[PDB]
């Protein structure tokens, strides 16, 4: 747990689900969504 300077981050496992990430990320953290947009890259150094 933590915010990062120089933005929230978290160490997370694979092991958990995506539901009660969900409920975190909308009832601790901001609001909900009508759109939802994915972008994939990384392996472009």
Do not use: M
Not at 23 to 39: A, C, M, Y
């Amino acid at each position: 747990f933590g915010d990062i300077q120089f933005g929230k981050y978290l160490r997370l496992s694979c092991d958990t689900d995506s539901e009660t990430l969900y409920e975190l990320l909308t009832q601790h953290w901001h609001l909900k969504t009508p759109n939802l947009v994915i972008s994939v890259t990384g392996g472009a150094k």
